[PDB]
Copies of this chain bind each other. A is one copy, B any other.
Amino acid sequence: GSGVGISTGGWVGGSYFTDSYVITKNTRQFLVKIQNDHKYRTENIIPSNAGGKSQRCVSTPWSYFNFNQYSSHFSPQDWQRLTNEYKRFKPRKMHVKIYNLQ
């Protein structure tokens, strides 16, 4: 069953360490609001006393998720254990869910 009164997921969290791999799990509550009055605009950024530097950007009515940083995926406990017990690491697979929308 699914509907208004049924939740679409649950909270995941914590890390799991093995010899070959580590799994980090993180859940956040996010907020999305109307950006830019629902329209695309191309505006100039002209700073004062910037050494002549200027940018032109297109502002969209869109926002985005950014997962790029280690602090967000590792607790200080997990980072300590990672850098103390392992000689190398790389990311392998990433899975993202968006659910329980209001």
Interface residues of A (CB under 8 A from B): 1-6, 19, 84-85
Our pick among B4, B19, B84 for the contact of A4 (Cβ within 8 Å) is B4
Q: Give every chain B residue within 8 A of A6 (Cβ-Cβ).
A: 2-3
Q: Are A1 and B1 in contact, CB atoms less than 8 angstroms apart? A: yes
Our pick among B3, B5, B19 for the contact of A19 (Cβ within 8 Å) is B19
| Further contacts, 12 of them, CB under 8 A, given A1-B2, A1-B3, A84-B84 | A1-B1, A2-B5, A2-B6, A3-B3, A3-B4, A3-B5, A3-B6, A4-B4, A4-B5, A19-B19, A84-B85, A85-B85
Nearest opposing residue in chain B for A5, CB measure: B4
